[PDB]
């Protein structure tokens, strides 16, 4: 992974949340870990990690709350504005915002801010040229709006300075958690089931996210009929992944799951 640290804020506005569900939700991640949350019901920006709560005061959260309530306001109008521009009424629609900064592996800094309507690219900031990139004709009026005045200047300033400044603080605040390594606990299972042996390898509770899980046959990497579920989250911030492979019944002994992860000094080999 090229990126060393990341700060990402996202938000969602919807016309059809579901019954009793908040129509607006915003959250923030540091190095992929959820550290703050707000929604249109609670109406409060709140801490989601101990290390953030331990290093912030009430005025900090009042400011985040104020910012979130403003973003909610903007989105409340937004849903209408964009429906109008797409000549739509009622139905299920969404507005999504995603922005933040990345500190890569040699000191390089990245900054982004992009929006989507009904889960499709709508518009994205191009801080290099200080313009906004319209994905569709319906975004042109927004582009025009945003390129007026000093809005673009402020957004660039936030992404390149403010965002980074705070990312480095957060990374400092929670380095004990964020910089830790949790060992995976692995299970290999087999199911005999239909003239086909299906072997399964599961790595439970590893951290950080990056991991490499492979099936070996007779010592050699394999390849065919391997299926992976990718990396999925646990409730506690650690991660989970499962890989399966189809084999011929009785060949169980020939297979090994191989796990490569930062927490392990040497790749782990697991048999059924």
């Amino acid at each position: 992974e090229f990126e060393l640290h990341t700060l990402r804020y996202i938000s969602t506005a919807m016309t059809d949340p579901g019954p009793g569900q908040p129509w607006y939700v915003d959250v923030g991640y540091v190095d992929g870990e959820l550290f703050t949350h707000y929604n249109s019901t609670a109406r409060r920006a709140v801490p989601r990690t101990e290390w953030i709560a331990a290093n912030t005061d009430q005025q900090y959260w009042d400011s985040e709350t104020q910012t979130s309530q403003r973003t909610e306001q903007i989105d409340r109008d937004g849903l209408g504005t964009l429906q109008r521009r797409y000549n739509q009424t009622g139905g299920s629609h969404t507005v999504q915002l995603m922005y933040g900064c990345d500190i890569l592996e040699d000191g390089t800094i990245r900054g982004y801010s992009q929006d989507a309507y009904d889960g499709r690219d709508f518009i994205a900031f191009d801080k290099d040229t200080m313009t906004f990139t319209a994905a569709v004709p319906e975004a042109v009026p927004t582009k025009r709006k945003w390129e007026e005045g000093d809005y673009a200047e402020g957004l660039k300033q936030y992404l390149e300075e403010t965002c980074v400044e705070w990312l480095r603080r957060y990374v400092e605040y929670g380095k004990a958690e964020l910089g830790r390594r949790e060992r995976p606990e692995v299970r290999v299972w087999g199911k005999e089931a239909d003239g086909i042996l299906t072997l399964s390898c599961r790595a439970h509770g590893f951290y950080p996210r990056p991991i490499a899980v492979s099936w070996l046959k007779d010592g050699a990497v394999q390849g065919q009929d391997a299926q992976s579920g990718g990396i999925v989250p646990n409730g506690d911030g650690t991660y989970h992944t499962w890989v399966t492979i189809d084999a011929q019944p009785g060949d169980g002994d020939k297979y090994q799951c191989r796990v490569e992860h930062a927490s392990l000094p040497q790749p782990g080999l697991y048999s059924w």
């Binding site: 804020y9 985040e64 910012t67 903007i74 964009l82 801010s113």
Partner: peptide, 8 residues
């Protein structure tokens, strides 16, 4: 910290 963007 979050950053306020503006109206669509």
């Amino acid at each position: 910290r979050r950053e306020v963007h503006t109206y669509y």
